[PDB]
């Protein structure tokens, strides 16, 4: 039915919130080191705040990122199609062409309905919950029920194949009910 949409989870923002793309069949926006030879690897002007560039992630592949902060020795960057924040130096950055740069940003924020992060969650337990959700949901394609639109993003509810995830979060005291 029409309330069910397909999403790909790319990043775990918190115990009850993940970042992800809507599934529409279009291939991912990522570049091999083989498709970034060094003519395309150096800018005409040193990059700056809010510029949209290619950036090198831990997997050795380039992704679209926006510089959201600048310091003398590092940039702080946000991957616009994946939603994780990193710190990089200029050597990790490559100019991104306007045809690829103009494509809309694919990352959005989804909240699991009916649960929130536990108030008593310690720093360590928070890290551990993030790792559990990474083990289950990271880079996973699945249909979900788009319950609602929010100012932040979307409120989704899991279907029968993934409805155990909020149950486990409640069971493991990573989450409480809203």
């Amino acid at each position: 039915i029409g309330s069910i949409v397909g999403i790909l989870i790319t990043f775990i923002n918190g115990p009850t919130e993940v970042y992800g793309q809507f599934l529409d069949g279009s291939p991912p926006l990522v570049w091999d080191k083989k498709d970034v030879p060094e003519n395309k690897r150096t800018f005409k002007s040193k990059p700056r705040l809010l510029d949209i560039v290619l950036a090198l992630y831990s997997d050795g592949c380039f992704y679209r990122a926006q510089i959201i902060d600048e310091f003398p020795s590092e940039y702080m960057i946000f991957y616009v199609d994946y939603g994780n924040t990193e710190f990089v130096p200029l050597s990790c950055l490559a100019p991104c062409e306007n045809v690829d740069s103009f494509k809309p940003h694919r990352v959005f924020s989804f909240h699991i309905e009916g649960i929130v992060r536990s108030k008593n969650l310690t720093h360590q337990k928070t890290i551990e919950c993030i790792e559990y959700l990474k083990s289950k949901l990271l880079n996973t394609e699945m249909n979900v029920h788009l319950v609602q639109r929010l100012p932040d993003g979307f409120l989704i509810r899991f279907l029968d194949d993934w409805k155990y995830i909020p149950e486990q979060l409640l069971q493991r005291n990573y989450a409480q009910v809203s």
Partner: peptide, 4 residues
């Protein structure tokens, strides 16, 4: 393709 996507990250693993």
């Amino acid at each position: 393709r996507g990250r693993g």
